Amino acid sequence: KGVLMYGPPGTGKTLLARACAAQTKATFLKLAGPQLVQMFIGDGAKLVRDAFALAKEKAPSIIFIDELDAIGTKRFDSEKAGDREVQRTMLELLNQLDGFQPNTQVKVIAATNRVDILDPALLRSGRLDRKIEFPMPNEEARARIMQIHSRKMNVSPDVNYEELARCTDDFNGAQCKAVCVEAGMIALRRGATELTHEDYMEGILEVQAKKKANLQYYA
Amino acid sequence: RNDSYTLHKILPNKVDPLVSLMMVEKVPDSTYEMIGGLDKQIKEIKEVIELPVKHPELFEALGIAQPKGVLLYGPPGTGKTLLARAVAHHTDCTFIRVSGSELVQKFIGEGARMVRELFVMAREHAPSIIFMDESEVQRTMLELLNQLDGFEATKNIKVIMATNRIDILDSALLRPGRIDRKIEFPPPNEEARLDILKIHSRKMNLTRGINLRKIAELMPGASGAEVKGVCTEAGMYALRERRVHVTQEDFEMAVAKVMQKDSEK
Amino acid sequence: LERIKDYLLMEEEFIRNQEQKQEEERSKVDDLRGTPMSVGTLEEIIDDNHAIVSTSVGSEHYVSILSFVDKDLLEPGCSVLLNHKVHAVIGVLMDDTDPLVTVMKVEKAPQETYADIGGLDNQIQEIKESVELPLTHPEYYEEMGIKPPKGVILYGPPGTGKTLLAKAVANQTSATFLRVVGSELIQKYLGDGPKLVRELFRVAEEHAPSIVFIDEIDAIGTKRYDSNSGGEREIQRTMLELLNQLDGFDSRGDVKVIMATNRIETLDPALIRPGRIDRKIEFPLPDEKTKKRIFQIHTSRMTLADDVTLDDLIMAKDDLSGADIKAICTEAGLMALRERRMKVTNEDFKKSKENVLYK
Amino acid sequence: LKVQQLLHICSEAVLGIALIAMGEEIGAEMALRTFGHLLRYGEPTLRRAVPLALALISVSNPRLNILDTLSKFSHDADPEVSYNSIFAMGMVGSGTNNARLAAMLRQLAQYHAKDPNNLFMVRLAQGLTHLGKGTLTLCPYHSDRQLMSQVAVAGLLTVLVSFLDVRNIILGKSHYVLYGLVAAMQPRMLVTFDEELRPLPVSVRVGQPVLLAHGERAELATEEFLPVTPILEGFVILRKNPNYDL
Amino acid sequence: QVEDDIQQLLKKINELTGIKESDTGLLAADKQTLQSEQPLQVARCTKIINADSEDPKYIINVKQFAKFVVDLSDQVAPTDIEEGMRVGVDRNKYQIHIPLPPKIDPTVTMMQVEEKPDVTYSDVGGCKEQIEKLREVVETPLLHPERFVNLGIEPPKGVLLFGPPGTGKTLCARAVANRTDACFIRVIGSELVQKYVGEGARMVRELFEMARTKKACLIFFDEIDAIGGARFDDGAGGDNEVQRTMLELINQLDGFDPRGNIKVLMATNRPDTLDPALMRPGRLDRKIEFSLPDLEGRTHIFKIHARSMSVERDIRFELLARLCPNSTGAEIRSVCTEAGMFAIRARRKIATEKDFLEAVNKVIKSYAKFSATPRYMTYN
Numbered sequence A: 001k002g003v004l005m006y007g008p009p010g011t012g013k014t015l016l017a018r019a020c021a022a023q024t025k026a027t028f029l030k031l032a033g034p035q036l037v038q039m040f041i042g043d044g045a046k047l048v049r050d051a052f053a054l055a056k057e058k059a060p061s062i063i064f065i066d067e068l069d070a071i072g073t074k075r076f077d078s079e080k081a082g083d084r085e086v087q088r089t090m091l092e093l094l095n096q097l098d099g100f101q102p103n104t105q106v107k108v109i110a111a112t113n114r115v116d117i118l119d120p121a122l123l124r125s126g127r128l129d130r131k132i133e134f135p136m137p138n139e140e141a142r143a144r145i146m147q148i149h150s151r152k153m154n155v156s157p158d159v160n161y162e163e164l165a166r167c168t169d170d171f172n173g174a175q176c177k178a179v180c181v182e183a184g185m186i187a188l189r190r191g192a193t194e195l196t197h198e199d200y201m202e203g204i205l206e207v208q209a210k211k212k213a214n215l216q217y218y219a
Numbered sequence B: 001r002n003d004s005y006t007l008h009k010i011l012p013n014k015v016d017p018l019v020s021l022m023m024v025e026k027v028p029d030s031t032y033e034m035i036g037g038l039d040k041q042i043k044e045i046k047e048v049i050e051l052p053v054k055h056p057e058l059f060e061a062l063g064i065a066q067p068k069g070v071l072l073y074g075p076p077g078t079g080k081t082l083l084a085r086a087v088a089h090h091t092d093c094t095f096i097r098v099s100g101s102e103l104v105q106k107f108i109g110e111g112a113r114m115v116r117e118l119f120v121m122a123r124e125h126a127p128s129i130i131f132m133d134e135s136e137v138q139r140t141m142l143e144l145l146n147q148l149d150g151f152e153a154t155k156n157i158k159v160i161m162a163t164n165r166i167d168i169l170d171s172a173l174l175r176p177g178r179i180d181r182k183i184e185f186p187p188p189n190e191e192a193r194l195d196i197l198k199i200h201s202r203k204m205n206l207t208r209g210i211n212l213r214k215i216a217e218l219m220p221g222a223s224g225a226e227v228k229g230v231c232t233e234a235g236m237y238a239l240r241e242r243r244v245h246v247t248q249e250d251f252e253m254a255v256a257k258v259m260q261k262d263s264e265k
Numbered sequence C: 001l002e003r004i005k006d007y008l009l010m011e012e013e014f015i016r017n018q019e020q021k022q023e024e025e026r027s028k029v030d031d032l033r034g035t036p037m038s039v040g041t042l043e044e045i046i047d048d049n050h051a052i053v054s055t056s057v058g059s060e061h062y063v064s065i066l067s068f069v070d071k072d073l074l075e076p077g078c079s080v081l082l083n084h085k086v087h088a089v090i091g092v093l094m095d096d097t098d099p100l101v102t103v104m105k106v107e108k109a110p111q112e113t114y115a116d117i118g119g120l121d122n123q124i125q126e127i128k129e130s131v132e133l134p135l136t137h138p139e140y141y142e143e144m145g146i147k148p149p150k151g152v153i154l155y156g157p158p159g160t161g162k163t164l165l166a167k168a169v170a171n172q173t174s175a176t177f178l179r180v181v182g183s184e185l186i187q188k189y190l191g192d193g194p195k196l197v198r199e200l201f202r203v204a205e206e207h208a209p210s211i212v213f214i215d216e217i218d219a220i221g222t223k224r225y226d227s228n229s230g231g232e233r234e235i236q237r238t239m240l241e242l243l244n245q246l247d248g249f250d251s252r253g254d255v256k257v258i259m260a261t262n263r264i265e266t267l268d269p270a271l272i273r274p275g276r277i278d279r280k281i282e283f284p285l286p287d288e289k290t291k292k293r294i295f296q297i298h299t300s301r302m303t304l305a306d307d308v309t310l311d312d313l314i315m316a317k318d319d320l321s322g323a324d325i326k327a328i329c330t331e332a333g334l335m336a337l338r339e340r341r342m343k344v345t346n347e348d349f350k351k352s353k354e355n356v357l358y359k
Numbered sequence D: 001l002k003v004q005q006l007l008h009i010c011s012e013a014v015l016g017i018a019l020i021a022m023g024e025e026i027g028a029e030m031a032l033r034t035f036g037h038l039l040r041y042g043e044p045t046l047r048r049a050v051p052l053a054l055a056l057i058s059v060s061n062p063r064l065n066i067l068d069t070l071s072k073f074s075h076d077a078d079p080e081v082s083y084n085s086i087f088a089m090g091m092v093g094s095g096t097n098n099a100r101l102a103a104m105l106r107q108l109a110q111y112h113a114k115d116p117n118n119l120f121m122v123r124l125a126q127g128l129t130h131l132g133k134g135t136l137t138l139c140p141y142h143s144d145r146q147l148m149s150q151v152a153v154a155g156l157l158t159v160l161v162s163f164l165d166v167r168n169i170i171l172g173k174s175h176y177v178l179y180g181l182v183a184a185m186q187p188r189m190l191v192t193f194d195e196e197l198r199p200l201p202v203s204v205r206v207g208q209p210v211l212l213a214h215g216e217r218a219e220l221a222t223e224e225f226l227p228v229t230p231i232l233e234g235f236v237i238l239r240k241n242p243n244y245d246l
Numbered sequence E: 001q002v003e004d005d006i007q008q009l010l011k012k013i014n015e016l017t018g019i020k021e022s023d024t025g026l027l028a029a030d031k032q033t034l035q036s037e038q039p040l041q042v043a044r045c046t047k048i049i050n051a052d053s054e055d056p057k058y059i060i061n062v063k064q065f066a067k068f069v070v071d072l073s074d075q076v077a078p079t080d081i082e083e084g085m086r087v088g089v090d091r092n093k094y095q096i097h098i099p100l101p102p103k104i105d106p107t108v109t110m111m112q113v114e115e116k117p118d119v120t121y122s123d124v125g126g127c128k129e130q131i132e133k134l135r136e137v138v139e140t141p142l143l144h145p146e147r148f149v150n151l152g153i154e155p156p157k158g159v160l161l162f163g164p165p166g167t168g169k170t171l172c173a174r175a176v177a178n179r180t181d182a183c184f185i186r187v188i189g190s191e192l193v194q195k196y197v198g199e200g201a202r203m204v205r206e207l208f209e210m211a212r213t214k215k216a217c218l219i220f221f222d223e224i225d226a227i228g229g230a231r232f233d234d235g236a237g238g239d240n241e242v243q244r245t246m247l248e249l250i251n252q253l254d255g256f257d258p259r260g261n262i263k264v265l266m267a268t269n270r271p272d273t274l275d276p277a278l279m280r281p282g283r284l285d286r287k288i289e290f291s292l293p294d295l296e297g298r299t300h301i302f303k304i305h306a307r308s309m310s311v312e313r314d315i316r317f318e319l320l321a322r323l324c325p326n327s328t329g330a331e332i333r334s335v336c337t338e339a340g341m342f343a344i345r346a347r348r349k350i351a352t353e354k355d356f357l358e359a360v361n362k363v364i365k366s367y368a369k370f371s372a373t374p375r376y377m378t379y380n
């Protein structure tokens, strides 16, 4: 019964949705966790039901839920005040995924940059069956990503990805991209034709964002 | 005019909002002659309020910035609100009770966003005494103290802020000049009680052969309210005994029954 | 002589001015409308002299203005004259006397005077010059390519004379005086520290050049009132709000800023930094001379026994400020009024000193 | 006499306030504020003329507001408005671009061709845009002479009836009446001259652009150095402190 | 007075004059158009639930009333009427009369700048590097949009500014919105968190809603720390409301469905309390820092600041700049104006070296206890 994506916030999960969206000929159901968050004491549950019904009348359907945390968060037990909506909506949602009356007509895919705050009645195993890590990638994969974003732009013959890949220090996917991005704007400076190795090093040089210097006294 | 939507005529009365707020507060309308054991205060009060108003020319004629703010501190239930009400009553000044009720804000103030509006109404019915019962209250009076500290105009308005244990109130509310006359309430002894005792027992139908003193003697640690409870029970006791009158015995029981409660929670 | 020709010229101007078919046209303009019309609120707008309105009953009609008065005179989300037919915009309106400008807008005189604050000076010239000056004689800065002292801060113990200054200036000032307390800057409703600041600042910007004054800016931190929410992740924003409003973007204009805090150790540096608050002024606690002016000033306006010597009192307390001295002055008053005595005596001040100070 | 009069004469002629842009000064207090509102008046005689009338205003109090609105109303009820909205922006822009007419030069810079006549008018306009290398200023009184010039004043309503008469009838029977304004047309000008006084080195405080030699460009400068009679904005001739004399 | 005399009588002429033809000529701009458009119409706005086919009949919920499945105007095709479209509804007849556009509330439009803050790159001395990249995030892509295609890439679609309090970040916003051209949305996080639950989400949308219909617009967020930076979590659920608001901003700011030509400028003093989801690139790429001027910088700051006033031309701001190790460019300003007081405090036109020296020692030093530039350096 549906999956749950988690891991760094830059590895790459929204693409996976994007991937399914383009692939899964089924009626894609993308929804934000914040939206379900409403004012009128009865919008979150209603909307979920509304969304949980609309899907049940167009089988098949993959409902994507970005950041469950939006609507995903444990339920404390205080006195003085405390989130009722975000809770109930979860509850409502909970009562939808599983609970009275089952359904295998709808696929529910939720990513969260943080698989902790989520209450412990969303994971279980019935709600979302498969807990799925998105580990910040290695290098070759990095070498693999850079390439993807290096594809379009006009490069030349002198850009040892692996080097770049190696230089990369714990870079969630996008930061390669960012390097890739920056290196380009960098490369546009001297308006040179196609980028080069140096340009990328400088993307790294910046896509890192490690402040100034003056520490030129080391060694 | 209904469809013409022009004035057909002007009906009478409007109902007032400040009056409505006061009604909703319902703070006993107390006249002096009913509080024995609270003169020195009263005198002080008169000095800090009655005299200041009756003839502001007295303190103006002396060359002294008249006062605006007062403090009452002591046990809870000895007769503080009365001194604020009785004067205010005897003062013919609108006496306001601004606490923190959302009901009151919806009536008087259309929510606004602060407590400065409450002053607008007090102005309007000025001379008007502003009272306040027992952290949030402190600030509520603080803002008010600054509005009547050469910075507000008009005049003839005294916030009585009368709480307990002056050690509770903040410092900023004690900068020697800022609570004009600080008067303190004393616990109620045999006399004060005796007096208070005679005032409350006067309400009900009290038979002869009734020594009240003997009663306050048994009493030890009561206030302006406690005694009221005793009397009531005395009646309450007699009411259950199917007897209109109320001998001394009754009161002597209530003492315990109240001192039961006095010893209870 | 030409003065007469000048005067009558001024007079003839008055006549033509007062000297302001049409009656029908005016009635046409009356007839056009409806008696009676209908209030309703602005929403969107369009060059078609019509947009959608907003109503309590919430009919939202598309409607024209009856056009002599203007659409640009108004903003979206504003109550407008509507017929009862189509709710046709019949004209603009005047944002009735709100309950913000009032409270925040001290009209009557502030009392006191710049020759009532015994024992001050450099503190005085600093404030005045930085604020009162550029307001009255602002003609120098226009040549030294300087501007005015942005905001100013007053601090020190409790009774140094910070509120006097805010009171002194207002006494001989000429600009709208907005008296907003930070303590009031703390309400019991989420996202309400940023409305108050905007309304006070928005009200200040409207009334044109004015003095925004914030006494006890510290109370915005050094305090956590029960009825509140968020606890302190809310006050912070409210600070942030103040910090941003009292600061950047747009172009504040002539909103001068006066903050009255006792402890400057509990102010966010963002508020203290210059730009936001430049001149930082201290209020020392008299000594032996200032007090003399303070004592002489407070006992000089009353039947103070010419026998006693303000000195005894001055050299009395240890570090008594400009308040305590005033309390003693007043104490005698009540003493005076107590034993019924036009003029006070020694003990009267003594009892006062021991009645106020000590206690 | 312009508003008070016309205002009562119009409501009791579409070229009426066109002249008004004219004696300007008022082009800023009202012309710049109410000018556009005039222009907005649905009567094309206004929508024709105001864009023209803005010109001296535009070099005497031009604005950026309507400057964009002309773009909006370009095709609104009319393509001649567009034909103006291109041309007019050239006009007001051709001697009063950027600074006060920043929103003006932009458009025309984004005006090229949807039409060979637009292109014609744009070439006109962008010519006008860069007329005088894009730096010119229309002011009845060149520099800071402190005296009204009836020479150019005559050069204007001349241009009003010329482009106003042929405008009310057909496109343009001609196009040789373009330059009638030149009788006063001045650059963006600070004329900064020396103590002998035929062109020679001499300088001022900073402009934008530098210390201005004899007749070097800027507009409305209040500088360090002194003129001779009544130091002012604009044309100022330069003598220097005997100790520091230069 | 003679000139003044001529002044009065001249004015009196028109005054006398104006009254004349006034008598003579004694509504239609509008009273026509009013009465013209009086026989016109009103139309209650409507919110379309959706249309249906094999024919039209559009299905709709108005507002204060309810749903009516009702016909549509003849003048509007069966297409130019997509769902979720506030349309106008022949009041009585109750039939689509005309279409319209979308709501944005009166909180998103109230912050669209209208005017523009005079702050050219002349006042932005000591930042040849800061503005240099900024211009890339904001300037170049919005104006010259050729190159980035000639080579096919993408620009830092959003950019981050941080630094202690007083580096000039708000000028760069003001600087940009000045020589920019695009639509500069000034939205402060102070704006973002309000009262009732799930209310900020509407703001970001509107923001991104209004950002959208207008290609090439600068959204700027100063004090983002207010909106939401950290994602705590515990048995209190405190900074929760704001967090989502951030997630909302997060989500719509770079997560599923592109965003568009909404470039992004964030200003902080504490770039340390900020959610990785903000920071990451895509959402926040170019990361720019605003140093506390060194040597050559402050000289530009001094010269820039004092360049606009009557100062002594002998005295060299360089010396002063030297005595200013790590003071932001703001304080340096209290000096330049500070001398103003001193210079005015005597009676003088021009200030001296000491006038500045004192100011330096008067501002800097004296106002050192405060500074807060050393506590905000480590982003506390």
Ligand SMILES: Nc1ncnc2c1ncn2[C@@H]1O[C@H](COP(=O)(O)OP(=O)(O)O)[C@@H](O)[C@H]1O
Residues within 6 Å of the ligand: A008, A009, A010, A011, A012, A013, A014, A015, A111, A113, A145, A148, A172, A173, A174, A177, E255, E277, E282
């Ligand atoms: N394996 C990958 N290959 C290419 N791009 C990736 C990969 N993983 C992540 N990304 C980048 O990350 C971005 C999406 O980030 P995402 O992980 O969806 O954020 P979040 O996880 O917070 O939703 C995309 O622009 C994509 O370029």
Ligand SMILES: Nc1ncnc2c1ncn2[C@@H]1O[C@H](COP(=O)(O)OP(=O)(O)O)[C@@H](O)[C@H]1O
Residues within 6 Å of the ligand: B028, B034, B035, B036, B037, B038, B075, B076, B077, B078, B079, B080, B081, B082, B196, B199, B223, B224, B225, B228
């Ligand atoms: N001195 C007094 N004499 C008689 N009754 C008193 C006295 N003080 C208090 N009371 C009784 O207390 C009641 C009001 O209590 P109050 O004093 O207002 O509460 P608090 O102790 O909080 O001020 C009155 O009904 C009154 O009967």
Ligand SMILES: Nc1ncnc2c1ncn2[C@@H]1O[C@H](COP(=O)(O)OP(=O)(O)O)[C@@H](O)[C@H]1O
Residues within 6 Å of the ligand: B149, B150, B175, B177, C116, C117, C118, C119, C157, C158, C159, C160, C161, C162, C163, C164, C260, C262, C294, C321, C322, C323, C324, C326
């Ligand atoms: N030297 C003084 N001269 C005049 N008034 C004084 C002096 N010292 C104290 N006061 C009076 O005492 C009050 C103290 O207020 P303020 O100086 O604002 O203290 P705080 O800042 O702690 O509130 C003022 O209202 C002022 O009238």
Ligand SMILES: Nc1ncnc2c1ncn2[C@@H]1O[C@H](COP(=O)(O)OP(=O)(O)O)[C@@H](O)[C@H]1O
Residues within 6 Å of the ligand: C247, C248, C270, C275, E123, E124, E125, E126, E127, E163, E164, E165, E166, E167, E168, E169, E170, E171, E267, E269, E301, E304, E328, E329, E330, E331, E333
């Ligand atoms: N390098 C500089 N050049 C010009 N002005 C500066 C410079 N650094 C700081 N300033 C001035 O100091 C102020 C700092 O503003 P800003 O850094 O936006 O405040 P905050 O840190 O609260 O956002 C600006 O108003 C600006 O005029």
